[PDB]
């Protein structure tokens, strides 16, 4: 086989699309293998820039096509390099930018722990014709974390495995196993803005909706509950415009549903309080002392739903 | 004719545009036919990478252009492969990404059952010069369904048919029939988020609008109805920003129209109740006992409109 | 001159941009002319696929450049074909997708009748060197109309005319007239969603704003009118997010302006009713019986503005 | 030097981006110069289509690169033409589409008067090697103005000037002056939709906020003022979604600020009216007769801010 | 080594993406080095336009690839120039447009001071084979500042440094140091629109929420506080649509949180005032005189949070 050493430099990770489960990765890829010796002009190694590699390819130089498995479409290739040492080894350097797909479980959204995966594999050559010797990912771009949306934690996990394709045994007797490189970069979301601007106003609004049982008349309680329901709808429409459009509920979504249920239960209990009188001579006083049990029940509901 | 075996690998299906009735499909396409034998260098088969296939094409190698019938514009072709076995058979491998168009009936939106169709056909060669032998679509990318917007159900349906073009008989005597491959991938929408965040708050809001007949004064009922109508407008504007912009009504749209009609009928009945008095000495009491018939009538309306 | 027969196939029409007055058309274009006879390899006609037409062009084969006059920018050309019959005639087949511009009067928006125009003309050759013999547009893609945003009505109108350019007489003595093909495809908008979700809630909201004169106190009428004005602003912001951003008013826009004027006139008449008393001893009763003339006046205003 | 006559045809002007201060222009550019005579095949002039001009360029034909100075990025070049007359003169025709940048003062937004500028200049050749003889811009596409967002007024102003670059004197002794063509196309915005849907509802809402001093109780005036402030916030959010995102205030922005100040001053004066009583025995009657001076003061403020 | 003088012209800076921490820069880049003398045709220097530089590159002319380090993806290269003087020196001129990445601290958003950085470096050649002699950035495009979103202050700071790569010592003994050019362009945001349309209505709304303690009844104070909370939610949703989507709080965000806390504290103090009575015979008068201490406490909170 042919041994290839891979070095991957990460410049930035951005553009996390939540519905598409994709994200953009910009950086360099370095590939280095060894072939038959050639006589470069002079003792110095010969460097081939962009748009001159194809001349060497047409002349007969061997170079493999290293695609990304999880990239969506084609990467945006910048400058590309091919440096030909006279002892025999060839170094390929290129710059890429593309949308890379992964699973990215977005449940528990403000406190996510999702890793970014770059999968690399030769497009054509199997384990018997092309092996990956080692990969050292240099994700050295680590900076201050308070201005970063994604907190890159730890170091990039690198692994080399063999991938066997079951359909390729129809045309190939024993050589259908491909060498693959997988890169794991674990990241944590910056939770400060969401916690300070979405979770806390939800708590204040839900306590405001708790505050309806301190009124003295049934009519005032009813119109107060309707205005509170309008407030919750307005805040739901406010948070829908900012939060990602993932196809399932997050903590903020369940908190909004909980506030909806709190207002509906408040309406039901105040109506049942008003009409518990036998002939209209009783007062709605015994059951309306749930002002110190409605928030405790809501806190129990929250403690159940968080855990 | 020339026999071509097609293998299609599906990597991901995403980007379902509802107004345009299109969707994105990313994956590989494998084509395999047989020609005259050639002497490859050595006993091993010769592999042609990207941007070297055109040299073989200009030299005289025959390769057909397999377009997608329902793709919109041009697919985003990634790496492409041409592997030339010495016994005679040629394997073409390429990666595509493009927007594929279909019918995609979006009535009954949260509980959709819509299939994704990939239609393939040679661009130039008819049934007498190019036949498709068989297709085996490997849509093996099946994962956990609770984090997927689209639930890919079952297995991909594959069929090979002959398509006859009526206009081509003006220039061709008897050979105007083209071979086509059609692929069906049935999917079901993930209904949990819509059911938990849109259907249930609609029910709570509609029950809140039912709650106006439990008030005691005509004026309070009127201002309560106006605040409720504002709530329904706010929630309609909330759901318009999230739901797709399809050109017809879904279940949520008819539920919003039903809430509009409920509030308008409530206004009409409370006004007619207030002025049913002959000289202002009667009380609005007989007709205002529709507090237990307005929701039953609405439930009958819902049972009629759902079925 | 040289005679060219054109066949245009329409696959889909979509992406109607209202502010830009453009729309996307995807389909095929077929051109067929006749030249000097050539000896194709064998008795069968020779077919030239994509990226091999340029070799024949450089070798000396004549082929004209048929641009679209009203396309914006460049069309997205898919696969292209050139089939060379041995008797002499050449058939050019290509697939296009681009944004085509037209007038598209969007007044009376829900009940529009706007035609989609494709204009075709040789880029270089005039009437004396290139004539269009006939065009038969095959817009055969006609389906069920209840799931289509645009109802394609009738058949495509085809016409061939000569276009004379006045500036080209400065360099050319008598040959400055170009042959042009114009295609008309008339379409009608699907009006069901707009009529059921925008026109009807406007009528319900305007009748609700009519309902303020049935109150009994001046203060209640004032706060009711202010809440109704907030409702109209909310619904205006709701319909602005969905309706197209054309630079002039549609029926919904004039209906919103009419509701604005209704609420303002209601405020003015209730204030003038309250202060028509000489010393505060009169009652606001004679002029407040406009509860059955304010909607009739609004209906007259609507009947005037619709016609 | 070499004389070049330029003819520019404007097809459409659209896509005015206000924050970026750019706009899209689609049309043709014609360039015509004269060189040494050549023997075309036959007496007829030889026409070079697209993708064959580069063959003539490589063979030795001289053609200059005419860039647009104010275009952003690269124009989207459609079909290009090169027609070679046998007497010696060469005509270059090409189609362009790109984003052109200008100043475009967007103060006084509904009644704007902004011109669209296309600047043209050779990329390489100075005044001593390439001169522009004359330009005649054919902006003949003039149509009915009631369906056009931008009213193209008058005729295109054309001027040819010499541009001297001060840095190029470091490498060039006396030849650093470049010939430039500047085109002015003055346009007026269509003000009907903004005036009918934004200015008039602002006036109605501001008169509604004027209407609070006709109430009889301090509490009713306070809650009415708070509901009016909510109405103004809602309308501000309504107009923010539609109006352009220019970095400074327009007439609508100052009108919204004026309404904000009107409601705040109303709150301050009603509170100061309620507590001007010495011991609560006086009535808030002398200062509350500003119902006919608050709108006059606002009209004076408007007359000052408009002029 | 080889000395290269760089001249960079800035045409416009726009498109500041806050979440991506990128921005667009359009302009020219001039590179000038010296090589072996060549015999140009005639005494005049020979100019190579676009799409003819590759012919000289294939023939053997040396030209380096100067990439931008911080550009995202590939720049949109317009026309490119190569002018070959006969004494030996070569001038390379090209036009670029791309998204350049930087840190761009967006804390204290309306009064930002952020610099735009362009980093330039040869793609292949180190300090021993390619040195940058000097750079003179001509950012001469300075205009009136009242219509500019970004106020370009001062002059562009230029610096040339050597960058040493630690990984390249594995293949290179002593030559792993690269020459880099860094350009600083400091800019100040235009703060007038934000200060006049966001900060001032926040102050008016917060003073309106201060105004609740001047009411006379506990119920009126409660419903007034709920309407005020709805107003704050509406204004929060209004400012979320316009302000950038940076992942942390700005001054407007903390002001909105402060208004939320003010309304919640007002609700808590009025409820505690109502129920401080021993048997309902006391009046809520001693603690309700915080009408002149609630705004002073808020002003102290603002003075603490601003500093
Ligand atoms: Na609202
Ligand atoms: Na919105
Ligand atoms: Na929006
Ligand atoms: Na209210």
The CA dihedral of A268, A273, A274, A277, to the nearest 10 degrees, is 140
Give D242 Cα–ligand 3 centroid separation in angstroms.
10
E strand residue ranges, B85-243:
89-101, 113-122, 131-138, 150-152, 157-164, 177-189
User: With contact defined as beta carbons under 8 Å apart, do E216 and E284 qualify?
Assistant: no
User: With contact defined as beta carbons under 8 Å apart, do B76 and B8 qualify?
Assistant: no
CA-angle at B208, arms to B206 and B214, nearest 5°:
125
C261 SS3 class: helix
Nearest CA in chain B to A106: B147
User: With contact defined as beta carbons under 8 Å apart, do C205 and C236 qualify?
Assistant: no
User: With contact defined as beta carbons under 8 Å apart, do B36 and A39 qualify?
Assistant: no
With residue E298 as reference, give the H or E element that holds it: helix E294-306
Cα–Cα distance measured from residue C255 to residue C108, given in angstroms and rounded to the nearest whole number: 12
CA-angle at A13, arms to A11 and A15, nearest 5°:
140
CA-based nearest residue to A290, from A210, A194, A216 = A210
The tokens of A170 are what?
Answer: 């129809």
E strand residue ranges, B18-77:
22-34, 46-48, 66-68, 71-72
Backbone angles phi, psi at D252, to 5 degrees: -65, -35
The Cβ of residue C302 has, within 10 Å, a number of other Cβ atoms equal to 15
The Cβ of residue B149 has, within 10 Å, a number of other Cβ atoms equal to 18
Give A225 Cα–ligand 4 centroid separation in angstroms.
11
SS3 percent helix, strand, coil of chain A, rounded to 5, is 35, 30, 35
CA-based nearest residue to A231, from A197, A205, A266 = A205
The CA dihedral of B218, B223, B224, B227, to the nearest 10 degrees, is 160
* Alpha carbon separation from D97 to A197, D112, D153, E51, E143 (Å, rounded): 44, 24, 22, 20, 27
Nearest CA in chain A to E272: A214
User: With contact defined as beta carbons under 8 Å apart, do D146 and D88 qualify?
Assistant: no
CA-angle at A271, arms to A268 and A274, nearest 5°:
150
Backbone angles phi, psi at D109, to 5 degrees: -65, -50
Residues of B in contact with A67 (CB under 8 A): 78-79, 95
Number of residues that make up chain C = 307
The tokens of B165 are what?
Answer: 């073009």
Cα–Cα distance measured from residue C301 to residue C294, given in angstroms and rounded to the nearest whole number: 10
Non-local (6+) Cβ contacts of E285 within 8 A are none
CA-angle at B259, arms to B258 and B263, nearest 5°:
120
CA C63 vs. chain centroid, Å, equals: 34
- Answer yes or no: do B222 and C227 touch at CB < 8 A: no
Burial of C102 (0-12, 13-18, 19+ CB in 10 A): middle
Non-local (6+) Cβ contacts of A280 within 8 A are none
Cα–Cα distance measured from residue C76 to residue D81, given in angstroms and rounded to the nearest whole number: 20
Cα–Cα distance measured from residue D183 to residue D10, given in angstroms and rounded to the nearest whole number: 11
- Answer yes or no: do D205 and C233 touch at CB < 8 A: yes
| DSSP string across D17-65 | ETTTTEEEEEEEEEEEEE-S----SSSSPEEE-TTSHHHHHHHT-----
Interface-testing mutation among C148, C235, C252, with chain B (most B C-beta atoms within 10 A):
C235
| DSSP string across B216-269 | S-HHHHHHHHHHHHHHHHHHHHHHHTTS---SS--HHHHHHHHHHHHHHHHHHH
The tokens of D14 are what?
Answer: 């659209």
User: With contact defined as beta carbons under 8 Å apart, do E77 and A78 qualify?
Assistant: no
Non-local (6+) Cβ contacts of C87 within 8 A are C37
User: With contact defined as beta carbons under 8 Å apart, do D238 and D218 qualify?
Assistant: no
User: With contact defined as beta carbons under 8 Å apart, do B187 and B150 qualify?
Assistant: yes
User: With contact defined as beta carbons under 8 Å apart, do E100 and E150 qualify?
Assistant: no
User: With contact defined as beta carbons under 8 Å apart, do A165 and A158 qualify?
Assistant: no
D83 in the Ramachandran plot: left (φ > 0), alpha (ψ -120 to 50) or beta? beta
- Reported as half-sphere exposure (CB side, CA atoms, 13 A), residue E261 has a value of 15
Nearest CA in chain D to E52: D58
- Answer yes or no: do B240 and C235 touch at CB < 8 A: no
CA A103 vs. chain centroid, Å, equals: 8
The tokens of E142 are what?
Answer: 């300075």
DSSP conformation class of B95: E
The tokens of E45 are what?
Answer: 């220097």
With residue D160 as reference, give the H or E element that holds it: strand D157-164
Give the N- to C-terminal CA distance of chain E in Å, as an integer: 53
With residue A299 as reference, give the H or E element that holds it: helix A294-306
Give the N- to C-terminal CA distance of chain D in Å, as an integer: 53
User: With contact defined as beta carbons under 8 Å apart, do D149 and D92 qualify?
Assistant: no
DSSP conformation class of E45: P
CA-based nearest residue to C231, from B227, E235, B212 = B227
The CA dihedral of D72, D75, D76, D81, to the nearest 10 degrees, is 180
CA-based nearest residue to D209, from D276, D122, D294, D128 = D294
CA-based nearest residue to E239, from E259, E223, E221 = E259
Q: Which of D51, D77, D79 sits opposite C67 (nearest CB)?
A: D79
Cα–Cα distance measured from residue C124 to residue C142, given in angstroms and rounded to the nearest whole number: 35
The tokens of E144 are what?
Answer: 């009136």
Helices (H), chain B: 53-59, 192-194, 200-210, 218-240, 251-274, 294-306
Give D224 Cα–ligand 4 centroid separation in angstroms.
9
Resolution in A: 3.4
Cα–Cα distance measured from residue D217 to residue C204, given in angstroms and rounded to the nearest whole number: 32
| DSSP string across E164-229 | E-SGGGGT-SS--EEEEEEEEEEEEE--HHHIIIIIHHHHHHHHHHHGGGG-S-HHHHHHHHHHHH
Question: What approach was used to elucidate this structure?
Answer: cryo-EM
- Answer yes or no: do C123 and D223 touch at CB < 8 A: no
The tokens of B197 are what?
Answer: 């965040």
Shortest distance between the Cα of B190 and any Cα of chain C, in A, equals 22
Distant-in-sequence contacts of C302-305, Cβ < 8 A, 24+ apart? C302/C258, C305/C254, C305/C258
Tell me the sheet residues that pair with C228.
none
Burial of A128 (0-12, 13-18, 19+ CB in 10 A): middle
User: With contact defined as beta carbons under 8 Å apart, do E50 and E30 qualify?
Assistant: no
Burial of E266 (0-12, 13-18, 19+ CB in 10 A): buried
To which residue do tokens 């809520």 refer?
Answer: E284
Please compute Rg for chain A using Cα positions.
31
Instruction: Provide the angle, in degrees to the nearest 10, between the axes of the packed helices D200-210 and D294-306.
Output: 150
The tokens of C3 are what?
Answer: 């005679």
| DSSP string across A189-253 | E--HHHIIIIIHHHHHHHHHHHGGGG-S-HHHHHHHHHHHHHHHHHHHHHHHTTS---SS--HHH
Shortest distance between the Cα of A230 and any Cα of chain B, in A, equals 5
C258 SS3 class: helix
What chain D holds in terms of domains, given with CATH numbers, is 1-190 (2.70.170.10), 191-307 (1.20.58.390)
- Reported as half-sphere exposure (CB side, CA atoms, 13 A), residue C200 has a value of 16
Q: Which of A103, A107, A247 sits opposite B149 (nearest CB)?
A: A247
| DSSP string across D114-148 | EEEEEEEEESS--TTT-EEEEEEEE------STT-
Give A39 Cα–ligand 3 centroid separation in angstroms.
63
User: With contact defined as beta carbons under 8 Å apart, do E140 and E13 qualify?
Assistant: no
The CA dihedral of B175, B177, B179, B184, to the nearest 10 degrees, is 180
D214 SS3 class: helix
In this complex, which chains have at least 3 CB pairs below 8 Å with chain B? A, C
The Cβ of residue C169 has, within 10 Å, a number of other Cβ atoms equal to 12
CA-angle at E71, arms to E69 and E73, nearest 5°:
115
- Reported as half-sphere exposure (CB side, CA atoms, 13 A), residue C120 has a value of 26
């Amino acid at each position: 086989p042919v041994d290839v050493s891979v070095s991957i430099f990460i410049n930035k990770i951005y553009g996390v699309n939540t519905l598409e489960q994709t994200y953009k990765v910009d950086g360099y890829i370095v590939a280095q293998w060894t072939g038959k010796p050639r006589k470069t002009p002079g003792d110095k190694p010969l460097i081939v820039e962009n748009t001159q590699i194809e001349r060497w390819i047409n002349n007969g130089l061997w170079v493999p096509a290293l695609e990304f498995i999880n990239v969506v479409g084609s990467p945006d290739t910048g400058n590309k390099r091919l440096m030909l040492f006279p002892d025999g080894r060839v170094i390929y350097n290129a710059r890429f930018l593309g949308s890379f797909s992964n699973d990215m479980d977005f449940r528990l959204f403000p406190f996510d722990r999702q890793q970014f995966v770059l999968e690399l594999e030769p497009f054509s050559y199997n384990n018997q014709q092309l092996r990956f010797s080692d990969i050292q990912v240099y994700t050295e771009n680590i900076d201050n974390e308070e201005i970063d949306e994604w907190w890159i934690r730890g170091k990039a996990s690198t692994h080399i495995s063999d991938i066997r394709y079951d359909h390729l045994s129809s045309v190939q007797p024993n050589q259908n196993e491909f060498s693959r490189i997988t890169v794991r970069i674990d990241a944590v979301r910056n939770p400060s803005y969401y916690l300070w601007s979405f979770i806390l106003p939800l708590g204040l609004i839900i306590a405001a909706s708790w505050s309806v049982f301190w009124l003295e008349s049934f009519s005032e309680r009813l119109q107060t509950s309707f205005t509170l329901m309008l407030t919750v709808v307005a805040y739901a429409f406010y948070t829908s415009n900012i939060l990602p459009r993932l196809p399932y509920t997050t903590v903020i979504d369940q908190m909004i549903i909980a506030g909806y249920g709190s207002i509906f239960a408040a309406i039901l209990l105040i109506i049942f309080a008003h009409h518990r009188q036998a002939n209209g001579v009783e007062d709605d006083l015994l059951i309306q002392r749930c002002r110190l049990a409605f928030p405790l029940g809501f806190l129990a509901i929250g403690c159940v739903l968080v855990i």
